[PDB]
Ligand binder design. Sequence first.
Ligand code: HEM
Ligand code: HEM
Ligand SMILES: Nc1ccc2ccc(CCNCCc3cccc(F)c3)cc2n1
Ligand SMILES: Nc1ccc2ccc(CCNCCc3cccc(F)c3)cc2n1
Ligand SMILES: C[C@H](O)[C@H](O)[C@H]1CNc2nc(N)[nH]c(=O)c2N1
Ligand SMILES: C[C@H](O)[C@H](O)[C@H]1CNc2nc(N)[nH]c(=O)c2N1
Ligand SMILES: [Zn+2]
Lengths: 403, 405
Amino acid sequence: KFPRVKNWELGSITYDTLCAQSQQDGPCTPRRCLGSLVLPRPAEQLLSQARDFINQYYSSIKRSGSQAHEERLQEVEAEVASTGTYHLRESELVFGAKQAWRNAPRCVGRIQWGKLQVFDARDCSSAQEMFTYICNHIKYATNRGNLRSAITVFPQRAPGRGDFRIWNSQLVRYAGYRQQDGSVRGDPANVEITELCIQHGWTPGNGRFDVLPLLLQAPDEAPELFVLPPELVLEVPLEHPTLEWFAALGLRWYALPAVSNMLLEIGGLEFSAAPFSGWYMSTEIGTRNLCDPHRYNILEDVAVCMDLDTRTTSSLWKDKAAVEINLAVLHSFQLAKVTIVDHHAATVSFMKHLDNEQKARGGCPADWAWIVPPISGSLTPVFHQEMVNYILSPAFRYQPDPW
Amino acid sequence: GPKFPRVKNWELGSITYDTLCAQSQQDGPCTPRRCLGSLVLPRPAEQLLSQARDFINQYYSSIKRSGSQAHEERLQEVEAEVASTGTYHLRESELVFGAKQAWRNAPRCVGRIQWGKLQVFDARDCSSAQEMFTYICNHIKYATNRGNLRSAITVFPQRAPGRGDFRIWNSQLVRYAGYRQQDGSVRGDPANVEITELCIQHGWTPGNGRFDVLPLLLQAPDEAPELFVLPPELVLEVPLEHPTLEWFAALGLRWYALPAVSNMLLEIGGLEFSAAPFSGWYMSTEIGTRNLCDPHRYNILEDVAVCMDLDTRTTSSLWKDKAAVEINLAVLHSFQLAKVTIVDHHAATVSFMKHLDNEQKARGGCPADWAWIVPPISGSLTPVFHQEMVNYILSPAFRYQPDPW
Ligand code: HEM
Ligand code: HEM
Ligand SMILES: Nc1ccc2ccc(CCNCCc3cccc(F)c3)cc2n1
Ligand SMILES: Nc1ccc2ccc(CCNCCc3cccc(F)c3)cc2n1
Ligand SMILES: C[C@H](O)[C@H](O)[C@H]1CNc2nc(N)[nH]c(=O)c2N1
Ligand SMILES: C[C@H](O)[C@H](O)[C@H]1CNc2nc(N)[nH]c(=O)c2N1
Ligand SMILES: [Zn+2]
């Protein structure tokens, strides 16, 4: 039965009929909901996913049932029957990559889904070539602070061979150096990748904000190490518009959020290396990256500098510090002329996206726990909006770490 | 590993498995195809007997007399009673156990560390709306306790074959009126427009203020509801001021001390208590973020931001975030000054994490609804944000029920 979906602020109701198109199971059952969990616990199969995708494509260009549509289905059928696999045309790959972003239930930035630069790198045969494609992606996407969304797609998985992989979780990441006494210098999220880098011959630094090299892997070969040229990595020093001591904290963040460990699935084909980038929403940096207790954990430092009463939770010292940190991020990115969006503007655009998709497709898969921002939740319109979460394909998925 | 849900805390890196969800007898709204975890209200002789047996088994397990002669004789007594009357009745100690268990089982409640401390008033002898009012007044006096709040539930007679239900029409024992204006706006609390109009229809002379306490509309079996005015000295309220912003007191804001929810159904062993009002103390974000700042509630964010001289013409000034923090601080400061129990969202969530550890040891899990447990401001600043949770329905339970009108 199709869900009735209510907005509690406005009193409006919609019905999600799009979820009927879901062909893949999520983690929930009638006995228990696992919606808050971060990670998940043959030729006829491939052919039906392929046909479905080809049908989506020809529908998208208003050519369902055309000459071209019918011959393409026959091509895919012939290739799968003979070889167990098939290959996408570039225009199909472009459509597929935009659709995977459109379908991503955890992404609040999907108003932008139609504006995605797609780099075809399926003719890549070595880690060295991967690095060249990656440098061009970063160059294009960064665009001197006028950020532009992009994806680069490396060769698909093949039954015979190992995968193409980027070992790093993002193209730009700060090192996390574990101490002989358990603690971490830098970003604790990156301890393991930092150790792998050193293990593969990288000379580490000893700073809080050391940009990591890339570990890039061509099929069935040890990963190779490539240092990013410093001029390609745009960073923003953090300052606060009114609190002078904030700059003294020596905080900074990189401009480009470029996720590089997710699998892109299109028509049953799997692209194990397909890094994509957009621009940041300020709470990712200001709230999670800087204030998570298991990340840079700066809340106490800032609260102390603001002379707040740290001895009791009821002074709301954590809340006051977090606001000023998020304000510093916004101010600093605006001063540096680097694209950033605040959580109010982003969630308002996402509500417009929900409306657009209701009209276009009869629904929009959305994961409430990820869409609602990590500060000021109920001050944004998405908090009051019921959402239905489900998996459509094309999709971005998690995959195992290659080590 | 084990074939039970694996649950991770991302701050600590620690893992548990929920085995308690195996005891769920009732389906939620989700399927493998789609998750409906974010929806607020998603959509019998033999049946009663099996619910009753299960509940009697839980009771005897809890007093460690499972399989005993007293356990079997109680099962036989319930079977006999049902056989001859179609229903049964709980012993006083079963009702106390069942009420505490319903609170313990409530997945949307962040206050469950307190579950073992619940004063259960047995009002199952009540036979009139006038008497319900007396019991409600007594509950309020006990629970308010001059500002040193005590958790309590008052249980009125269960639903019974044929006979009509006991109902409290109001969603809470204390609610502010919401008066629809000629222009289309609302004076007072917009959440309460419908109950306000019903009170007027049933004969209440309305005021015209922003914080008018509503009368109670109380319904005894097969009777029209009757109107009762709470004596003002029984309704403890807290005027709001801010510790540093001296002008905040001039806004004339206030909130009542006692959150006393009155429209939920208490279900124990298949028996249905349609009138069982219960009360705790407030967590400060309920007042300061939701009731005062929701766009569809008092909606005071912009007024406060304007007084703070913030830039309300652009999202990126974070004016909403700054105003909300100060409003929440005012609530905490004001309740503290008034010596009225309140808990901030950091303290509440820290205690809930302790509750989760206790329940993992006691029962092998704890049903929890992440979207409701994570506070509405400062979510990731609290430890619950980083904790995966498994949501499922156990009974005894507090359940939603349709409006009596
Ligand atoms: C244009 C600017 C964009 C903004 C502001 C944005 C915003 C966000 C945010 C805030 C999240 C949650 C991130 C987190 O908490 O770690 C997210 C998740 C995601 N976004 Fe975007 N997004 C953007 C562009 C993109 C692009 C270009 C793609 C792919 C083409 C994409 C795909 C995703 C996916 C797959 C996730 C979920 C990742 C996961 O489950 O771990 N987004 N988005
Ligand atoms: C002792 C202090 C208590 C605190 C601080 C507390 C805290 C909370 C909070 C903040 C909520 C969410 C409310 C909302 O957003 O509307 C809640 C939900 C709930 N709590 Fe408590 N709680 C307390 C005591 C109680 C008691 C005594 C009971 C019943 C015996 C109870 C049962 C519930 C139930 C059933 C809900 C869910 C309501 C719904 O689904 O609409 N709690 N609790
Ligand atoms: N601003 C943007 C744009 C696109 C994004 C695309 C993806 C992401 C996700 C960042 N990944 C970290 C979350 C995560 C997930 C699973 C396991 C983890 F350890 C951590 C963030 C984005 N931010
Ligand atoms: N502090 C407390 C203590 C106990 C509580 C027990 C229950 C509640 C729930 C308040 N109301 C539910 C909100 C709601 C739900 C469904 C439909 C609505 F219109 C409104 C809040 C509590 N707060
Ligand atoms: C346990 C919980 O699901 C986890 O902390 C989630 C919550 N919501 C989130 N939302 C976003 N946008 N990003 C996240 O990493 C998370 N983490
Ligand atoms: C749509 C969404 O489920 C709804 O706004 C929920 C979210 N979380 C909540 N959490 C609590 N504690 N109380 C609420 O009323 C809500 N509202
Ligand atoms: Zn679910």
